Subunit: 494 residues, 4 copies
């Protein structure tokens, strides 16, 4: 049930999107976006900078003015546009999945069945919320009638990463638009193409001009410009924990814009001795190697109870050596290339530190192909908490397996981190599952599964893995500004 | 029915409160707190600094450890302890009101009937939330059971101002303690005493050691230490917008602690021509002069429709000329002194700027007594949007009256501001009231009333008046960390 | 924008709908359904009875068995099917409007622009609710993890009236299907055809067999059979109060199935002396004469303050005289015929009694045509509370205009009724609106409008106008069975 | 820590409680209430009938009038009153516990530590809800502002049973008074004394006259008069399924008042082979024998997996034989007498039935003393589904143990019942716990525990065990009438 891909899809949108129009950058500068499987340039893209962001923000501010089409629009009709957008994305599903693989590197099978399926589900879910996020009527003391209005927060700056271009765009636009906000979105320079085509679909669906504006560009230029703009009411950022800090400083430095962050992780995958061996091994493989390890909540610390450690290691090693690496448009390929040169080198550098500090390399370790940013599935064994590969986010196909004895021990070790994005627990015991799910300091805890996302269930970080939540009802909170209206009445009665 | 005050209440607590015990500062250094009615010193207070804050955060962290009495305590019993603390405050109500007046300057009548009443109601409102802030069970796709846990955010740094010492303390501790957080509080140097006595009642109530820790001191020292601490999970700040920017920068530069801000305003009070004149005059007077003008949401821009301007102004002047300034322990006193020398001078400087930039001085405008920080009820007329007194927060008993013609005009002028804490509309017309409360960009809009606060009704700013909300159900949101638990199940059914 | 009607639409569906297939009655009996504009039979329809209801319930029970396609289906996919059903209704919108007008008699323009629009909005609203009606996780005392599942109530019997055949069908299916129930629906003998056609669309949309079953037939046989059935879990009935009482008794004397009722009314439309006159007149006309007066919430007691009574009356009578009565497919027609001969007679009898008892007949009064059940727009002035036409629900184009003096008077006079479905207040004054909206004992109070329905806002009776609510989040409550799960854990922590 | 009881406690209240005053019946009639431990009369109590109920309903209705102290009272203050009542009950705990034991028969240790504790927790829980049950503001289509008020349902009839007299009174009063309703309560003739004393405390707490009225008397007279009353808006009833039918019929037959029902059950307690045997045996014993087996959700069907059956039965019989039956005031006593002679005889009837239909009597099965109504702890083994003792509620100390093999089997057999109040599952396996908790058709499913109640977690029946839920937020739903107010506005914006 996967239709055939077009392995060289035409590029139709490569410009700045403001007011449902396509614009070259003010400076006329451009930048190349690259095909990571070949390393060849796909096409040139307009390089937005502050001046282009200023244009986007003004366009958005005007679309948001009291009495505008977007503000007067019925809430139900915002839901109707979101469903229309989703129908258009479904019409062009194969195209977009192929364009995603071309620009990102992830396998086309995964793009089609996972990424675009989740885009469609996210947009259709939030379509449903548009007219259901009620304010409150409140039994305040005295002769008063008091109630809340859930207004849009306003102009929302949204900076999205390269690991899931399409899906992250959906994750941001969905809540924003459902609650009647306007956006200025900065797409990642590595993967700008799918998001710009979606902008063309946003025009086709019938969204008023300026409601969604997209400005491709670099982090320190366009990203920073959105972060520090005096008329952006809210910023939402998914990227490194390092940059997250820069984003929050920029907001305090600028106009006290509201901030939410979805950052990195070093997520513990915990395998108890009573776990289903086969299922655990396959899921822990998935937990780490999914999307070429380019996953903020990748199970990068696989904790295994000592009684089953040896069997688990041998099975994991066998599975990693069997994982097919190659052309992402091949239906047999399970792992495509990494996204770019920088990440390629970064990963190879982290593998070097693993070997340097005495972690046992059990398979892979090196480059997987002569052409493109391909890296062999790599497993380290006998990993220690103090090792660099056990502490820092690698964001590549590099597995760390650790040994533990007691449940008290692994809790302490799992939680001993400045990250807390996700975690997982594999066990057949009811009490162990509940004890561990409670104790783990993680935004999402999976029990006998991994990477189970639904648009209905919130996702986000504890500690320095981020603040605020995306998905679910919770994802609407940061896109709402609460107004209390309190009216004197002649006589208050229950 | 007000009980006669003790006009010289004994001071019992004046040190640093950590682990239900009283500590001198590591440096052993103290600072004076002044009785603003006299300019004389009440007592010395321990000057807390970074190292004292570090001790408090350690005490908070230990009390928040999994397995501790506080973490294991039933949600319902947390409510009982909050209800117990409320009873203890009510028990000592006459004393606390007197001490509030002693150290802050506000009238004893107001301290007793307004301040302590709202303290009691806040604590009792939040006691009710302890066991009712439910997470969710979520109908996710696939064979999964998914639900959310609403956990405490953890160690909460709380910085409160000097204008409502006891009430601002209750606003912070209520929602923090109801949701099982631990607290490191920084009280203002000008008004530390009442907060510190409440610490004794917190211990007497039965709160475990370290759950509430209070460290008096300066803003640049103790305040900056909390906002920048590596192991504080959350900071809530109330104060000026200037300082709010520094807090958010400090959060971003340290450990990405979650931030909420309650800041200043320049709130518009809009009087339509069909307003009840006598009610509007009295309420607009209260809106501005309440608490010696020292209200973030003070009605400092009194917009009056041109048809009723002259009459409104005459009536407003007569009310201001009759306002009794004097000893706050005298039952006839409406207005006590300003809080300290800095504010006394600051307000006088603004008064000077008002008559210098062409605003019409109608009454007052000078010092009201030769001892203490008493300022005359001052009223400016013919105030224009360009004037400093129309733009900046004076935080004193200084009234600005501006004239307007149409409803379209006043919406534009009222919203043209970087502040947006509150606003008011006075009108008998249904459509006018809905038109305005809708169009005004403010966290709270009062209709035919002003300064009506209820624990059930959220409060907080638009724009640079803040982020987040206190009071109501909304107050618990910033003190909760959300954890999704997603469990594989044999077969999901509806 | 209304496309040209096929004025004699073909009837495709006229049987019993069970397991996505069409069935003759077990007895083979059929009954005629009439075109009320002519008095002639459109076609014969299968007369469902106890035996047929027994088969429909067994099919419903089978489709509801644990592990069935319907039970295992993702909540989000239930929503997709509802939106698909809506698209299919929208596809066949012109046909459905014409068929609705043929069987019911309402003008085709109203049928197209109002009834089908509201059908579409209702279904799309509840599609959104399918995967959002969360249960809770509950901070219970002791070492336990407690939560609630919101499960479907089960086999739902749904009995709909004839005044809004398609809309009332949507009002019932929307919430029931969103929450994953199964339905045995009984449609009105006077108007079964459109509901049976929608059953074809239900099959086409993709709903599993047995999820929706429809049994056209008589009230005392097919209706009572559902209401008394030992394996039906929940009954929703919309119709007369008298039969409402029969339904609640039948639930009680069988299996204690859950009951919700949408019953009649004698709703007060209150015109204060300060209302907009032209608006009030047109809304009062609308309030009463919409759908040939066949609305449960019709403004059948129009209270007009004495200072504006004469003008209001003259204008209302002038409006009633110019109201165009005739063939509902003609574009000039504002008022169609009544639904059948019994209503035709009943309404005329109420008109007789109005003249007798001393209400001034101001216009109309009799039969409007020698063909079909057309009644003249009729107005009664100087109506007093004790009059039969002031007490009892006429359900026809017969207006009652009553005079009052004070606000205290009208509240008490309005509330002195065994009914309480809706009310309306027409005024420009803020306090009069708030005073009246609070004091009126009605499920919906409209302020400066009438018959304003939204899928998002709940609708239902006080007193004997019904119990429970439909539409909004509230309309899901009656279709949910709450399950508590409480699980022993090792150690509960916040 | 249990204070020594007064074994012959004085009676202070034995009359009808209307308008905070004590009244004899209009007929001056009284009835004796019996001490089930001795079979001797305690005292006479006023016998309320139709005329007394009518007086009570008029007092309730008067207290509910617009502008009354109770309607005008701040929501937060209702909260305060409930908290005061709880403190007064706690003050008089020893007495109330002793009185409860004297009249009902249950162990004094249990009354004091369990019943009274739960009464305090229920009332304090609902105190917290008084000012937090918000209506909604709703984004409806068009130029309208729409919102819901949550008003009180009105005059609420409350009919409570004799098995938990104090607790059941709290479960009714809490949610009703929290939401501002007024109450006419009928207490059980077997156990009216503790409720009447609490009425004194309700007066002392400061609840306005008429808010709570109590009419002691008999079911067919006083009870029926409440259910049939034309000015009662709602009836909540707890008792037998049979009488529940009578109440629903009466409600439909009169004024369509709203009905919730809490009825009997035949709850399955499922013991899987991997259960903790020691824990499972003690919990199953507690599940059945608690409160002399007079619990609606008693684990009256103990399903034990075949591999552990013989050992479980052996241990269960030994535990039954060791249960101490005696004077409920004696600290050694585990089991008191049944409540009265009617239940005494009925239980002996059921025991006889078990023997006659082939159930194997393992211990007890007879009368345990010559005085009072004491029955031997009785255990039947090898019970089959088609047996009457396996089907019908015995409401005595009679245990049914059934054998099963497969998890799929036990689901069907557990669900093959017209009841569904509760169920439990004992297992160490996560997947079995989730599979059963989902598959069991019951309002509460306990996992590895039984009879775990929390004021926070709802309770109620599936099928014929009741409808509606008490406790938690859900307990408020039945005490709320929802009013939609939809207001036309000049220009709707988001
Ligand atoms: C933000 C985000 C989204 C998705 Br889908 C993910 C991740 C992170 C992962 O780490 C993963 O495996 N899938
Ligand atoms: Na690329
Ligand atoms: Na003094
Ligand atoms: Na007809
Ligand atoms: Na008794």
């Amino acid at each position: 049930a996967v239709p055939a891909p077009n392995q060289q899809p035409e590029v139709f949108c490569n410009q700045i999107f403001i007011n449902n129009e396509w614009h070259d950058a003010v400076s006329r500068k451009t930048f190349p976006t690259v095909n990571p499987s070949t390393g060849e340039v796909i096409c040139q893209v307009a390089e937005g900078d502050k001046e282009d962001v200023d244009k986007a923000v003004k366009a958005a501010r005007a679309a948001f003015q009291l009495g505008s089409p977007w503000r007067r629009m019925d809430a139900s009709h915002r839901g109707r546009l979101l469903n229309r957008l989703a129908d258009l994305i479904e019409r062009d599903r194969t195209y977009l999945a192929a364009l995603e693989t071309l620009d990102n590197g992830k396998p086309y099978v995964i793009s089609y069945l996972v990424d675009l399926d989740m885009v469609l589900k996210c947009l259709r879910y939030y379509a449903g919320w548009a007219d259901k996020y009620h304010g409150k009527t409140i039994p305040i003391d005295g002769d008063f009638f008091s109630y809340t209005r859930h207004e849009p927060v306003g102009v929302c700056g949204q900076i999205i990463p390269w690991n899931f271009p399409l899906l992250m765009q959906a994750w941001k636009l969905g809540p924003a638009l459902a609650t009647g906000n306007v956006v200025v979105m900065k797409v990642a320079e590595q993967t700008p193409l799918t998001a710009l085509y979606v902008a063309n679909l946003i025009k086709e669906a019938g969204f008023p001009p300026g409601v969604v504006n997209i400005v491709p560009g670099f982090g320190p230029t366009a990203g920073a410009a959105i972060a520090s703009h005096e008329d952006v009411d809210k910023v939402a950022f998914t990227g490194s924990t390092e940059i997250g800090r820069v984003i929050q400083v920029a907001a305090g430095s600028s106009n006290l814009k509201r901030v939410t962050l979805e950052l990195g992780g070093k997520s513990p995958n915990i395998i108890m001795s009573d776990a289903d061996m086969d299922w655990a091994v396959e899921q822990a493989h998935f937990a780490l190697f999914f999307n070429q390890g380019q996953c903020c909540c990748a199970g990068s610390r696989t904790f295994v109870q000592e009684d089953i450690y040896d069997e688990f290691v041998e099975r994991s090693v066998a599975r990693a050596k069997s994982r097919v690496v190659g052309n992402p448009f091949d239906s047999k390929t399970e792992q495509g290339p990494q996204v770019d040169e920088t990440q390629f080198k970064k990963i190879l550098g982290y593998i070097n530190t693993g070997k340097q500090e005495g972690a046992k390399l059990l398979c892979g370790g090196g480059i997987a192909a002569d052409r493109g940013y391909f890296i062999q599935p790599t497993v380290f064994g006998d990993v220690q908490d103090g090792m660099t590969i056990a502490k820092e986010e690698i964001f590549g196909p590099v597995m760390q397996i650790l040994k533990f004895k007691t449940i008290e021990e692994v809790v302490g070790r799992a939680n001993n981190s400045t990250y807390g994005l996700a975690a997982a627990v594999f066990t057949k015991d009811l009490d162990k599952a509940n004890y561990l799910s409670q104790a783990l300091q993680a935004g999402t805890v999976w029990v006998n599964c991994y990477d189970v996302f639904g648009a209905q269930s919130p996702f986000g970080g504890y500690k320095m893995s981020g603040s605020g939540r995306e998905l679910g009802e919770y994802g609407l909170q940061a896109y709402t500004e609460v107004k209390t209206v309190t009216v004197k009445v002649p006589q208050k009665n229950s």
